[PDB]
Amino acid sequence: IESGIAHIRSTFNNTIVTITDTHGNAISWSSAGALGFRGSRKSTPFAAQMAAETAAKGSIEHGLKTLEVTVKGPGSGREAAIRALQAAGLEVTAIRDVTPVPHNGCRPPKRRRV
RNA sequence: GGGGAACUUGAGUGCAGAAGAGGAGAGUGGAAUUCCACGUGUAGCGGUGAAAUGCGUAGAGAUGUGGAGGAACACCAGUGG
Structure with missing residues (x-):
């Protein structure tokens, strides 16, 4: 194939990276536990x-070449995929920080020391 | 203190404005969480000080559309109203 987008989710635990179609259909994916961290x-x-x-x-x-990277979540891997996938010979076109921002949503769990 | 009579600053009324997340009512949306239907897709994700229990080849997690449903109402937001 020729074109697709790249989802990256870099949470406090995992850096989950999927390479999907432009209209949302998966091709390849891996993360840290996929490698063995x-x-x-x-x-x-x-x-x-x-x-x-x-x-x-x-x-x-x-054989797909064009990418479209959407960063989702607070972590450390939002710079690394820029460093990796551009050096992977792939065309990184656009970079979004799409965290799913709640307006008010539902109430979060407690602070860890209460 | 009581009675009789006046004055208009106290307080109130009219009139002309201006501010407002003040209340109560019926209805309205928009992201987001999950749930479920399914495509696509494979070995884990999930979580911590570290790790396990839980979840997963019956196809999870991620991802695409669609569906139900609740509750909360970012941004504005400010010793601001």
């Missing part, structure tokens, strides 16, 4: 460095 090493920028490259190898298997 077993513990709480999953949030490191080295983990998103390794995880984005392995998913991009499945894109070369399907």
Whole structure:
């Protein structure tokens, strides 16, 4: 194939990266536990460095070149996929910070020390 | 203190304005959470000081559309009303 977009979710634990179609259909995906970062090493920028490259190898298997990266969530891997996937020979076109922003939503859980 | 009579600053009324998340009522949306239907897609995601229980080859998580349903009403937001 030729074109697709790239979803990245970089939470406090995981850096989950999927390469999907432009109209939302998956091709390849990986994360830190997919490579073998077993513990709480999953949030490191080295983990998103390794995880984005392995998913991009499945894109070369399907030959798509153009990307469209949507960053979702607070973490550390939002810079690493820019460092990885641009160096992966793939065309990074647009970068969004689409965190799903609630207006008020539902009430969050308690603070961790109450 | 009581009675009789006046004055208009106290307080009130008219009139002319201006501000407002003041209350009560019936209705209205918009993101977001989950739930479920399904496509696409594979080995884990989930979580911590560390890790496990829980969830997962019966196809999760991520992702695309669609559906129900509730409650909360970002931005404006300010020793601001």
